[PDB]
Amino acid sequence: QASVSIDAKFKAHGKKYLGTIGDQYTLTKNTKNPAIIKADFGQLTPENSMKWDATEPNRGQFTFSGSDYLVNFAQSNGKLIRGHTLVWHSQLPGWVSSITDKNTLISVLKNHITTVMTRYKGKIYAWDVLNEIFNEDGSLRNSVFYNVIGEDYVRIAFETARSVDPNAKLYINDYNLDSAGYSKVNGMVSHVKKWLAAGIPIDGIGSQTHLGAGAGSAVAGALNALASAGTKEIAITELDIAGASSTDYVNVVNACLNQAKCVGITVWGVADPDSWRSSSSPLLFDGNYNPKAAYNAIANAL
Ligand code: NA
Ligand code: NA
Numbered sequence: 001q002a003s004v005s006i007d008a009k010f011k012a013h014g015k016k017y018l019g020t021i022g023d024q025y026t027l028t029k030n031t032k033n034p035a036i037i038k039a040d041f042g043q044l045t046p047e048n049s050m051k052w053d054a055t056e057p058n059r060g061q062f063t064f065s066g067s068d069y070l071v072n073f074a075q076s077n078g079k080l081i082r083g084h085t086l087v088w089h090s091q092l093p094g095w096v097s098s099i100t101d102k103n104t105l106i107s108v109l110k111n112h113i114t115t116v117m118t119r120y121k122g123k124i125y126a127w128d129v130l131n132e133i134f135n136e137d138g139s140l141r142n143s144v145f146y147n148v149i150g151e152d153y154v155r156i157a158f159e160t161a162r163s164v165d166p167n168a169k170l171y172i173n174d175y176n177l178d179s180a181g182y183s184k185v186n187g188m189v190s191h192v193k194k195w196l197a198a199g200i201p202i203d204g205i206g207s208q209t210h211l212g213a214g215a216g217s218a219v220a221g222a223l224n225a226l227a228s229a230g231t232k233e234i235a236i237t238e239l240d241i242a243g244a245s246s247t248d249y250v251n252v253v254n255a256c257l258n259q260a261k262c263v264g265i266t267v268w269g270v271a272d273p274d275s276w277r278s279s280s281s282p283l284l285f286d287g288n289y290n291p292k293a294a295y296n297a298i299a300n301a302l
């Protein structure tokens with residue numbers, strides 16, 4: 001645990017949190033990881049336990065051991081939770097992707113959303129209701145949901161989520177929304193404007209922010225562009241930067257800081273060895289679970 005908490009410093013500027021991720025393994029693999037989470041971060045997103053493959057492996061049969069653990073740890077330690085994720089083309093069981101009848105898929109979708117959200121009703125700050133539903137060009141991804149139900153799946157997902165847990169902020173999350181003017185950014189904005197105008201309850205836009213070295217400075221403009229979609233809020237949801245340079249990390253932190261709609265940042269992992277992109281050493285803590293230069297840079301920029 002770093003003596004200075006970047007989450008505490010971020011909150012002092014009016015932000016909701018500066019968080020990270022976890023699940024049973026990383027929370028128990030050693031003593032430093034959970035200690036770092038409790039001391040320096042104020043929010044948690046389950047890395048995998050809440051995804052469709054892990055929660056409803058078979059039709060109508062749910063498995064909540066792993067998600068229960070993450071939620072219970074977060075709640076027992078004063079950490080906000082971002083549920084992740086409800087509807088996604090990846091990490092989706094074959095029983096779902098093989099469905100071809102529209103009403104059947106809708107029933108399945110609603111039951112999945114309802115069962116998962118009901119179990120953690122009132123304990124979730126925000127839910128990534130929809131994940132990665134856009135092609136790079138801004139058009140809608142031809143996932144099973146889009147192919148079988150059509151664009152109406154967006155309304156169905158959000159309305160169902162809103163009804164099940166009105167306390168949670170409902171988000172649409174995506175990657176490559178990293179610079180103003182990018183086709184995917186433009187598509188996100190135009191679709192969300194349309195959906196909101198149609199009465200669909202979308203509270204926020206989540207920008208994954210999985211970056212390469214030197215890409216941090218473009219984030220400020222991206223958030224500004226995303227702000228025009230008209231949602232109540234936005235958030236950097238899965239932050240990691242190849243090389244973890246101080247300039248890049250400070251640039252991203254400042255991007256959120258200077259944008260009213262950005263409620264917080266979630267770094268996708270604590271220490272490099274546990275990163276899904278470990279070969280790029282993209283996190284704030286090293287192989288010894290010690291704070292890297294970027295962590296201190298962030299602490300001193302706040
Ligand atoms: Na998850
Ligand atoms: Na689970």
Ligand code: NA
Nearest residue numbers: 089133143145
């Ligand atoms: Na989809």
Ligand code: NA
Nearest residue numbers: 162165166168
């Ligand atoms: Na809601």
Ligand code: NA
Nearest residue numbers: 226227230231
């Ligand atoms: Na917005």
Ligand code: NA
Nearest residue numbers: 235236237266
């Ligand atoms: Na976040």
